[PDB]
């Protein structure tokens, strides 16, 4: 029963585990470099273990060092996005189940894909510099040598010596902080991660951070001058923790703290265990995008507990996590509610196909990323898709009560592990026996491994939703005659998540004329929202409805911030626009140097420069 990792070079878990990690790094703004040791207890899985790999990215290795004397190791040639391969020569044959402990020293990239290092320009307070990491999927192996595949799981301790003026933060419960007795000039901070994680949610933050507690176990962390609206914005995060362990069994992870990152940040969230990371594009002023929050809390259970062996199988981590973060929003504020979202990402689904394609391989569920990027590959549809298929389940297994049980048995049967589809499925079928012939009406094959939207849409309460849709049909439908009917007052009745799913159905059936356009500026003055779920969509209409004013607006939205799902598709916008093309590829060419390596990766190649 092999089921290797494609994406990673590593010796693979049948044959050793990293088991701990003790990490002791140096944080370097003048050269962008990390530098330290990353001593690996790695057990055997073999008998006469003479060898074993590694996956690394751009990093320079000094030296390895095994029982107090260095050891022969080789870097193989660069994989493209991969990495390079790192094999180590164990000086003594290992029997099955030994442990040894191997301590690589080593230094990053300045151009680690890991990483995004700012300048103090680039930041809040404009006196300091500023780093943190994405590891997720497999960009760990850019800022340390590690089997870099979420199929082995590890705990971790951390010593980092940073700047004395500034914090670091990671992935782990913090503990303490002393003076770096090798350079006064900098302080020591300490950190252990007590439960087994994979690798990919390894984090690190260094720069001026101060908190504010919002919960019994949780502080917001920022620069000094996001941290109070930041504790506003995220003032449910206890409730929807209480609701999540119900749902889900014990929060196991002591702290649930929140950093909210600089605007590059290229995710709305990532759920780093300790220590969910978020953009500051959350910051709305009235909560209205807080359903980040609940789905970051909800990773704790699913993702972070039970997680994708390969990322294959990513759809695991995230349909569940999209379920029951549905499911947090439907305890808060209603059933009624939690069909609104689902509808939203059903739609959000057939966007992505429509992108696509309808037979691209990317929209399967499950997808062989064999050669190719997990950066490339991700979207909405194993979030989308991996919910619908939930839902379904949910619908014909007997209701909400009913699948949420077996949520809670299956984030039980596999914490601690790492799993595939065919895990899932067989314990879905155990739990479910008694309905297996409901079960076996699922058409497996096409759910799972067909390209496209789903064989079969689950049924969705359509009362939130009908004036979005009514009113959105009004404005395709109207006519230049019709366009003096419209008036502020068509918004009286819709809340903010509801303008948005009217705009979300607009942009479906853009473009719309011009002068469409300009009259809903003018009754609507959407110019003045500063909701960037509501702005993104309202520029994208605009833009693709060849509105020139606009232009200046969405370059604007493109760079001040960062995050991927509103920076891409601007870019894209703007590139296929013939009036704004060249500033577009000018202006995405003159930021690129200060951009996240991965989002500049992305722009590029959406913009097919290079
Ligand atoms: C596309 C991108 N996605 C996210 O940031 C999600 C976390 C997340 C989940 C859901 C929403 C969401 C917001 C509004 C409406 C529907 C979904 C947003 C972010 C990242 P995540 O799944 O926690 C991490 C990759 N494991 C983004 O939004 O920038
Ligand atoms: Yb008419
Ligand atoms: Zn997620």
Not at 190 to 210: D, H, N, R, S
Not at 263 to 276: A, Q
Not at 413 to 429: C, E, H, R, V
Request: proline share 6%; net charge negative; hydrophobic share 35%.
């Amino acid at each position: 029963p092999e089921i290797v990792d494609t994406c990673s070079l590593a010796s693979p878990a049948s044959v050793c585990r990293t088991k701990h990690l003790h990490l002791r790094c140096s944080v370097d703004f003048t050269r962008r470099t990390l530098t330290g040791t990353a001593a690996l207890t790695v057990q055997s899985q073999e008998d006469n273990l003479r060898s074993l790999v590694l996956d690394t990215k751009d990093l320079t290795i000094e030296k390895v060092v095994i029982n107090g004397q260095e050891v022969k190791y080789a870097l193989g040639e660069r994989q493209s996005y991969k990495g390079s391969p790192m094999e180590i020569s164990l000086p003594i044959a290992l029997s099955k189940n030994q442990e040894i402990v191997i301590e690589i020293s080593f230094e990053t990239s300045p151009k680690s894909s890991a990483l995004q290092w700012l300048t103090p320009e680039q930041t809040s307070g404009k006196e300091h510099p500023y780093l943190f990491s994405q590891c997720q999927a497999i960009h760990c192996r850019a800022i340390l040598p590690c089997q870099d595949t979420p199929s082995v799981k590890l705990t971790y301790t951390a010593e980092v010596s940073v700047p004395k003026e500034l914090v670091a933060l990671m992935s782990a419960i913090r503990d303490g902080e002393t003076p770096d007795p090798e350079d006064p000039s900098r302080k020591i901070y300490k950190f252990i991660q007590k439960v087994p994680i994979p690798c990919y949610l390894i984090a690190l933050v260094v720069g001026a951070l101060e908190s504010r507690q919002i919960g019994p176990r949780t502080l917001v962390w920022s620069e000094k001058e996001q941290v109070e609206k930041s504790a506003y914005e995220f003032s449910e995060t206890e409730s929807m923790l209480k609701i999540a362990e119900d749902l889900g069994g014990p929060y196991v992870w002591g702290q649930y703290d929140l950093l909210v990152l600089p605007p590059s940040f290229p995710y709305g969230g990532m759920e780093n265990p300790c220590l969910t990371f978020v953009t500051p594009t959350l910051l709305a002023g009235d909560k209205s995008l807080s359903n980040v929050i609940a789905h970051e809390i909800s990773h704790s259970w699913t993702g972070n507990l039970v997680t994708n062996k390969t990322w294959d199988h990513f759809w695991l981590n995230e349909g569940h996590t999209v379920y029951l973060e549905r499911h947090i929003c439907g305890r808060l504020f209603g059933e009624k509610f939690r069909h609104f979202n689902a509808l939203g990402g059903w739609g959000e689904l057939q966007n992505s196909v429509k992108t696509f394609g309808e037979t691209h391989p990317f929209t399967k569920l499950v997808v062989d990323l064999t050669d190719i990027d997990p950066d490339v590959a991700y979207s909405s549809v194993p979030y989308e898709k991996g919910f619908a298929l939930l839902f379904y389940l949910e619908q014909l297994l007997g209701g909400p009560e009913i699948f949420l049980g077996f949520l809670k048995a299956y984030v039980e049967k596999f914490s601690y592990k790492s799993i595939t589809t065919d895990d899932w499925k067989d314990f879905l079928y155990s739990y479910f026996k008694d309905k297996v012939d409901v079960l076996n009406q699922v058409d497996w094959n096409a759910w799972l491994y067909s390209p496209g939207l789903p064989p079969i849409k689950p049924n969705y309460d359509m009362t939130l939703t009908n004036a979005c849709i009514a009113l959105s049909q009004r404005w395709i439908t109207a006519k230049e005659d019709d366009l003096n009917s419209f008036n502020a007052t068509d918004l009286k009745d819709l809340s903010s998540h509801q303008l948005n799913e009217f705009l979300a159905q607009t942009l479906q059936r853009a473009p719309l004329p011009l002068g469409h356009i300009k009259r809903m500026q003018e009754v609507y003055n959407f110019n003045a929202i500063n909701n960037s779920e509501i702005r993104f969509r309202w520029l994208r209409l605009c833009i693709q409805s060849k509105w020139e004013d606009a232009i200046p607006l969405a370059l604007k939205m493109a760079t001040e911030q960062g995050r991927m799902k509103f920076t891409r598709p601007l870019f894209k916008d703007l590139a296929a626009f013939d009036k704004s093309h060249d500033q577009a590829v000018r202006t995405y060419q003159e930021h690129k140097a200060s951009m996240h390596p991965v989002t500049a990766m992305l722009v590029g190649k959406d913009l097919k420069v290079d």
